[PDB]
PDB file of C-alpha atoms in Angstrom:
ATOM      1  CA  UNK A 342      34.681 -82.902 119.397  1.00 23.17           C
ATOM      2  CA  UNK A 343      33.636 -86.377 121.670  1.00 24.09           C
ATOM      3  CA  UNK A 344      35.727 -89.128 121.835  1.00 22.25           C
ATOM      4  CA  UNK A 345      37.216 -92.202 124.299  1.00 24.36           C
ATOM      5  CA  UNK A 346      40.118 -90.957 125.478  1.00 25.53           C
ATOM      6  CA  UNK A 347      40.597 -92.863 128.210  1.00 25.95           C
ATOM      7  CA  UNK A 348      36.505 -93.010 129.137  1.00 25.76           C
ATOM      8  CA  UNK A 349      34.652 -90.063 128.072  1.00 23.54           C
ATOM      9  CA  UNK A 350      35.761 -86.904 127.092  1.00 21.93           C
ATOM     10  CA  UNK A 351      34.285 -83.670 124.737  1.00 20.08           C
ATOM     11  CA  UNK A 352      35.312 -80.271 123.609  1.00 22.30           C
ATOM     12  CA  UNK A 353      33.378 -77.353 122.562  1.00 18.99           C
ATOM     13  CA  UNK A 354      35.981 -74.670 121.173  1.00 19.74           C
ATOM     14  CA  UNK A 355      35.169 -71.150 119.876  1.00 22.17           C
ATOM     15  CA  UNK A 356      37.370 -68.460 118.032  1.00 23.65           C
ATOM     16  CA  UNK A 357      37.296 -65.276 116.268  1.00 25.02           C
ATOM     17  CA  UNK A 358      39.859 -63.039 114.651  1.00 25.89           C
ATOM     18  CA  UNK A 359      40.468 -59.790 112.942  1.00 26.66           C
ATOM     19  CA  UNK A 360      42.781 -58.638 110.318  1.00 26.37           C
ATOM     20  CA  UNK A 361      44.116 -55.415 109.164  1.00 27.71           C
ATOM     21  CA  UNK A 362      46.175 -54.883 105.489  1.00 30.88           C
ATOM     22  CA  UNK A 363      47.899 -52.742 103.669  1.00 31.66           C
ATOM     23  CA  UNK A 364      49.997 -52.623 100.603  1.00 31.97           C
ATOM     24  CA  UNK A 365      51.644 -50.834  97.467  1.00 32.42           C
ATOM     25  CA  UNK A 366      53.323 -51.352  94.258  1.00 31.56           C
ATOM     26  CA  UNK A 367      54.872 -49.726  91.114  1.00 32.20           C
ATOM     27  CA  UNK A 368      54.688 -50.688  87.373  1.00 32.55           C
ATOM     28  CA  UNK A 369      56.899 -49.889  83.731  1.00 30.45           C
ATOM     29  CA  UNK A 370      56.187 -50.031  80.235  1.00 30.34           C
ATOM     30  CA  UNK A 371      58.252 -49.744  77.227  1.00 32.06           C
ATOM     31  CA  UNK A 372      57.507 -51.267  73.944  1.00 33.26           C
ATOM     32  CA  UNK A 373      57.845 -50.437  70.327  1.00 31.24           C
ATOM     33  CA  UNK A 374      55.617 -50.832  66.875  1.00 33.10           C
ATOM     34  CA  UNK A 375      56.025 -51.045  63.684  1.00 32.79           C
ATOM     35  CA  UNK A 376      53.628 -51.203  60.281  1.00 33.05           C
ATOM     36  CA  UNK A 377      53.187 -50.976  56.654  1.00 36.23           C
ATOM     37  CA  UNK A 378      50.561 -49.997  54.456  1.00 35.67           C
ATOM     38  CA  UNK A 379      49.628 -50.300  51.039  1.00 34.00           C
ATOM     39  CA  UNK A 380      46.380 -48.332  48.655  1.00 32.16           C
ATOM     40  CA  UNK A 381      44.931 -48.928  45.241  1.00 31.76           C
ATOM     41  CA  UNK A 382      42.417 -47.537  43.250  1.00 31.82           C
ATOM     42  CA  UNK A 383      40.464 -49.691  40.620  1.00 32.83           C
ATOM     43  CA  UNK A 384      39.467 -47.510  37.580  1.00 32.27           C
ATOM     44  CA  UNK A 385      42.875 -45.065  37.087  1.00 31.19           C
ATOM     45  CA  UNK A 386      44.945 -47.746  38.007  1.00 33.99           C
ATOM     46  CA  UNK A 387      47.679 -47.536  35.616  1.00 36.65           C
ATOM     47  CA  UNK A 388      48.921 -44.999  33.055  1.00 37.83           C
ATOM     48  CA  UNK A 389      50.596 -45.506  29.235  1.00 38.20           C
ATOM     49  CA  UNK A 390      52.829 -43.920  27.022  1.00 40.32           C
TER      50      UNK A 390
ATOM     51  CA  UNK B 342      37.116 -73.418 125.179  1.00 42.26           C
ATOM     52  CA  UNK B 343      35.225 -75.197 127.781  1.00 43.83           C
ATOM     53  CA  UNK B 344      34.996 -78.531 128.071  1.00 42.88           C
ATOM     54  CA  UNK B 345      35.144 -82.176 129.733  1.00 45.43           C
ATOM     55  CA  UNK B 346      38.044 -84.307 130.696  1.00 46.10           C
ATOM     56  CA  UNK B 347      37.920 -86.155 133.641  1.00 43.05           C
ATOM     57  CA  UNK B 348      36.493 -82.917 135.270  1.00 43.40           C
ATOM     58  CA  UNK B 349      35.787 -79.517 134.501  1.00 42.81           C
ATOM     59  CA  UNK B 350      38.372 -77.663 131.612  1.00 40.39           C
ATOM     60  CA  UNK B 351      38.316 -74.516 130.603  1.00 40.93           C
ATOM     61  CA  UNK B 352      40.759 -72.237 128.573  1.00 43.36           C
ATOM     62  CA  UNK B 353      41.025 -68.980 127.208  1.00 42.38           C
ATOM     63  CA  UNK B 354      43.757 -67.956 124.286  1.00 40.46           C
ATOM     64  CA  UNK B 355      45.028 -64.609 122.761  1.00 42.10           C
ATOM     65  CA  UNK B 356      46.845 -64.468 119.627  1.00 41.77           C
ATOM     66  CA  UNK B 357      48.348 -61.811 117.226  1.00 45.03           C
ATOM     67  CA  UNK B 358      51.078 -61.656 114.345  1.00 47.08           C
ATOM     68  CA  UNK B 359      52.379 -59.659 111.600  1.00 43.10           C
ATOM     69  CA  UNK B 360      54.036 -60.600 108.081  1.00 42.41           C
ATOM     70  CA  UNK B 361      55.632 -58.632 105.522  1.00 44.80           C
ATOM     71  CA  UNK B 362      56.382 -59.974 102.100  1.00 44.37           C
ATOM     72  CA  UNK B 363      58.037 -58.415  98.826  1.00 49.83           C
ATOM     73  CA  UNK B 364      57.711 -59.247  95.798  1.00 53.10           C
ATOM     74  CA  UNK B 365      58.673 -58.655  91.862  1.00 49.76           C
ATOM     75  CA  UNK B 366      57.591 -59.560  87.948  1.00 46.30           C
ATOM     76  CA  UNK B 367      58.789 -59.348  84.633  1.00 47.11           C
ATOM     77  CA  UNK B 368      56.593 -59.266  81.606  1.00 43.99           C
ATOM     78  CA  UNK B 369      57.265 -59.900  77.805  1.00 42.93           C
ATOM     79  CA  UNK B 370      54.836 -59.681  75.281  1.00 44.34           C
ATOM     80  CA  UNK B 371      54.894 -60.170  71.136  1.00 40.35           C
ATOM     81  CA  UNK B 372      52.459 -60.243  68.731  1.00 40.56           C
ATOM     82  CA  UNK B 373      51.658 -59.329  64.964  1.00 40.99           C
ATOM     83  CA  UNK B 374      47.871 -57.911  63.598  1.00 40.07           C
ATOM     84  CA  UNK B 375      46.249 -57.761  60.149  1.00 40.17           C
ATOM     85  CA  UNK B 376      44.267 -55.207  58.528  1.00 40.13           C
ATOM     86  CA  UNK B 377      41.991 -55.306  55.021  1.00 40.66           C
ATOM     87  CA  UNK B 378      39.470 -52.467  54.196  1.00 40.78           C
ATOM     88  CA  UNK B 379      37.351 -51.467  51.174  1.00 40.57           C
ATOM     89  CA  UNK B 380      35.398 -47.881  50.215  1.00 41.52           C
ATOM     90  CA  UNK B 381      33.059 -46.949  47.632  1.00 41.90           C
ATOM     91  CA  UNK B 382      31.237 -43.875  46.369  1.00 42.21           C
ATOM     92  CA  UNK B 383      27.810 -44.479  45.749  1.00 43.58           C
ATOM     93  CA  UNK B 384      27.058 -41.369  42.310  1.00 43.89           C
ATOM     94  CA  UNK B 385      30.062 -41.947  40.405  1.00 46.28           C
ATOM     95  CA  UNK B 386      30.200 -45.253  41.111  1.00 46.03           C
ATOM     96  CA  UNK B 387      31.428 -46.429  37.418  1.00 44.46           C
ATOM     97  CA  UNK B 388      33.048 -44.788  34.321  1.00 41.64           C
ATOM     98  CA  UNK B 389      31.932 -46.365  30.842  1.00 41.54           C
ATOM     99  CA  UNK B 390      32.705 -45.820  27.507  1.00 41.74           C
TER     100      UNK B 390
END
């Protein structure tokens, strides 16, 4: 960075950095279900008396 | 950094840190489904009379 801070001025800045991490976690479940169902059968579908 | 300002500047920086966070979630979940299906037999397909 240059500017005019009071006459002339100018920076040259460098930088560098390093991280390290580390982590954990738990999870659950519990659910339910449900169905139906239905069948046919075209041909034999019905009896008589 | 190096640097001008009025003269000669210079500086040199170290820096370090740590963090810890925790952290939780709660889920819900609902939701229906649908289900058609067909079948044939191909010989004896169809009775007449």
């Amino acid at each position: 960075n240059v500017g005019y801070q009071n006459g002339f001025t100018a920076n040259v800045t460098t930088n560098y950095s390093h991280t390290t991490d580390n982590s954990t976690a738990v999870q659950d479940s519990n659910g339910e279900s449900w169905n139906t169902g239905l069948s046919i059968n075209k041909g034999e579908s019905a009896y008589i008396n």
